[PDB]
Design an enzyme around this catalytic site. Structure first.
Site, PDB file in Angstrom:
ATOM      1  N   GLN A   1      64.157  92.675  29.366  1.00 22.43           N
ATOM      2  CA  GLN A   1      65.508  91.999  29.247  1.00 22.43           C
ATOM      3  C   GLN A   1      66.301  92.620  28.075  1.00 22.43           C
ATOM      4  OE1 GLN A   1      63.517  87.952  29.417  1.00 22.43           O
ATOM      5  NE2 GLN A   1      65.360  87.460  30.561  1.00 22.43           N
TER       6      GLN A   1
ATOM      7  N   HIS B   1      55.235  89.387  20.858  1.00 23.69           N
ATOM      8  CA  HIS B   1      56.192  88.258  20.739  1.00 23.69           C
ATOM      9  C   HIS B   1      55.580  86.892  20.769  1.00 23.69           C
ATOM     10  CE1 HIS B   1      57.458  87.011  25.018  1.00 23.69           C
ATOM     11  NE2 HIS B   1      56.213  87.502  25.071  1.00 23.69           N
TER      12      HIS B   1
ATOM     13  N   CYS C   1      54.212  82.391  26.598  1.00 21.64           N
ATOM     14  CA  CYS C   1      54.043  83.542  27.461  1.00 21.64           C
ATOM     15  C   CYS C   1      52.543  83.769  27.605  1.00 21.64           C
ATOM     16  CB  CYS C   1      54.593  84.797  26.763  1.00 21.64           C
ATOM     17  SG  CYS C   1      54.550  86.272  27.627  1.00 21.64           S
TER      18      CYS C   1
ATOM     19  N   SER D   1      64.566  84.032  29.263  1.00 25.45           N
ATOM     20  CA  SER D   1      63.308  83.325  29.271  1.00 25.45           C
ATOM     21  C   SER D   1      63.130  82.203  28.246  1.00 25.45           C
ATOM     22  CB  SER D   1      62.171  84.327  28.973  1.00 25.45           C
ATOM     23  OG  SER D   1      62.072  85.369  29.911  1.00 25.45           O
TER      24      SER D   1
ATOM     25  N   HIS E   1      62.699  84.111  21.437  1.00 24.19           N
ATOM     26  CA  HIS E   1      61.475  84.951  21.020  1.00 24.19           C
ATOM     27  C   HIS E   1      61.557  85.159  19.436  1.00 24.19           C
ATOM     28  CE1 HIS E   1      61.221  86.472  25.260  1.00 24.19           C
ATOM     29  NE2 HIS E   1      62.479  86.038  25.215  1.00 24.19           N
TER      30      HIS E   1
END
EC number: 5.2.1.8
Length: 145
Positions: free
Chosen positions: A113, A41, A95, A136, A139
């Site tokens: 998630q 990702h 990330c 978060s 993505h």
């Protein structure tokens, strides 16, 4: 159509295309589940993310709207062939998987998630999602196996 896909019409051309409301992918061609998948990702965080901070930027202040604009710019570069997903994930993902070209490794259902999970298991191998929204951030997800 397979599950998740629907026939849509381009607003700009009127040509039929297909949209997946699980992965947010769209494609022109008509599209015709595994125990584990492997994905990479590229995450772009925003001020509403659960943790508004990353290796790139200690205080993330961008809005959700600005994060989605960044996501859409990277999707356009990747789909044009101008840049590879790995290159942009290494440079721009919020990330720490950025240090591994975005790779998360293999995972089964039950671990990530839910929006991220559902998009990952609904992608074909080699397929990239559209923008996928989690707590978060937003993505782009590439299924690699």
């Amino acid at each position: 159509l397979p599950p998740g896909w629907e026939k849509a019409m381009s607003r700009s051309s009127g040509r039929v295309y297909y949209f997946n409301h699980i992965t947010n992918a769209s494609q022109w061609e008509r599209p015709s589940e595994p125990a584990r998948v492997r994905c990479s990702h590229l995450l772009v965080k925003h001020s509403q993310s659960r943790r508004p901070s990353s290796w790139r930027q200690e205080k993330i202040t961008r809005t959700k709207e600005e994060a989605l604009e960044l996501i859409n710019g990277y999707i356009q570069k990747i789909k044009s062939g101008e840049e590879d997903f790995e290159s942009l994930a290494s440079q721009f993902s919020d990330c720490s998987s950025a240090k591994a070209r975005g790779d998360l490794g293999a995972f089964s259902r039950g671990q990530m998630q839910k929006p991220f999970e559902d998009a990952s298991f609904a992608l074909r191998t080699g397929e990239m999602s559209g923008p996928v929204f989690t707590d978060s951030g937003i993505h782009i997800i590439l299924r690699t196996e």
